[PDB]
Design a protein around this ligand. Structure first.
Ligand SMILES: NC(=O)c1ccc[n+]([C@@H]2O[C@H](COP(=O)([O-])OP(=O)(O)OC[C@H]3O[C@@H](n4cnc5c(N)ncnc54)[C@H](OP(=O)(O)O)[C@@H]3O)[C@@H](O)[C@H]2O)c1
Ligand SMILES: O=C(O)COc1cc(Cl)ccc1C(=O)NCc1ccc(I)cc1
Length: 316
């Protein structure tokens, strides 16, 4: 299987990338350096992760060392919810570029479909704990994203955590100039996303699977939640293939024509997670993994559920 997938902007995107949410700032520079040394060419970033400066130090050092050329890297970041306004989008993108020490992003995503009140706080709340919305809509935010392409700041634009109706809304936007290249969504054997993936793929939108290992380090994990990495059924498939459970969990979305972005700051795991291009899951393995769906989400947040554009009320 090829290492890159063709996007609807004509560029190629590496199907395996390194995730950086929760990567501590004192560890992420080495994580990214190691990743690039062992073959990663795609890094998934976001302003809200609060570590773009440190990710950027690694990228810049590897470019300066001539380990890789800029054209060989595929750097992704995301517009946070408090920057959905027309007059804030460019500055948000530019802050990310400055922190990452780049002159362009390969892909810039609307991080969530919901706009929040601008200000210092990433999750502005009212006194009862509800997020404070902005009156921005996804269509006007999309137009602002299109301007970034036309100004040379980003090569591609896309969306993240958009449900099927929201993807459709973008595709049906009056005067749409650029289709979204990517929809980045949670996807793993407990949340298999067959409906949304089929819709996006049918429209030429590439899907990126986040939390492919079930995000065991998510800060709201409870001791009782289901655990992909410990699931004996998945362990059995891994054992049959002489691979680790994580390697199976990474190969799974690859064979569905998805991009996948496992996170690690452990050098041995960063390397392990990349060694997924030399084995194949059978069709029966794939269907078996799909069968584990339980509609379980890592990524959801009660405080945001009443926002008009909160994505997880719809079935898909
Ligand atoms: N667009 C969005 O809204 C959104 C939401 C969530 C995530 N994402 C992106 O997707 C990335 C991945 O998702 P995620 O960070 O939620 O979780 P994940 O990649 O599913 O899991 C990361 C966890 O798995 C551990 N791990 C990694 N490789 C392992 C291996 N080979 N064996 C055992 N454990 C392993 C990591 O530990 P160590 O790091 O300690 O090694 C870490 O605790 C994020 O970092 C972010 O870039 C985007
Ligand atoms: O959004 C991500 O990429 C990962 O999740 C996070 C990352 C940070 Cl750095 C802070 C908070 C979250 C989080 O709470 N995510 C769940 C979440 C769900 C719906 C909405 I609208 C907003 C957030």
């Amino acid at each position: 299987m090829a290492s890159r997938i063709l996007l609807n902007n004509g560029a190629k995107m590496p199907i395996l990338g390194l995730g950086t949410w929760k990567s501590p700032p004192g560890q992420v520079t080495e994580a990214v350096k190691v990743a690039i040394d062992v073959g990663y060419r795609h890094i998934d970033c976001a302003h809200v992760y609060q570590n773009e400066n440190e990710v950027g130090v690694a990228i810049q050092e590897k470019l300066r060392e001539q380990v890789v050329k800029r054209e060989e890297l595929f750097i992704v970041s995301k517009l946070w919810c408090t920057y959905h306004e027309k007059g804030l989008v460019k500055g948000a993108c530019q802050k990310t570029l400055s922190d990452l020490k780049l002159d362009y992003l390969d892909l810039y995503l609307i991080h969530w479909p919901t706009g929040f009140k601008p200000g210092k706080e990433f999750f502005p709340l009212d006194e009862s704990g509800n997020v404070v919305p902005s009156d921005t809509n996804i269509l006007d935010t999309w137009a602002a994203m299109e301007e970034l392409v036309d100004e040379g700041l980003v090569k591609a634009i896309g969306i993240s955590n958009f449900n099927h109706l929201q993807v459709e809304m973008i595709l049906n936007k009056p005067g749409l100039k650029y289709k979204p290249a990517v929809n980045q969504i949670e996807c793993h054997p407990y949340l298999t996303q067959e409906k949304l993936i089929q819709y996006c793929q049918s429209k030429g939108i590439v899907v990126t699977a986040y939390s492919p290992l079930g995000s065991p380090d998510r800060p709201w994990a409870k001791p009782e939640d289901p655990s992909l990495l410990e699931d004996p059924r998945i362990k059995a498939i891994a054992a049959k293939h002489n691979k680790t459970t994580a390697q199976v969990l990474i190969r799974f979305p690859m064979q569905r024509n998805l991009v996948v972005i496992p996170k690690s700051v452990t050098p041995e795991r960063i390397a392990e997670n990349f060694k997924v291009f030399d084995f194949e899951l059978s069709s029966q393995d794939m269907t078996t993994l799909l069968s584990y769906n339980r509609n379980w989400r890592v990524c959801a947040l009660l405080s945001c559920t009443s926002h008009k554009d909160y994505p997880f009320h719809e079935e898909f």
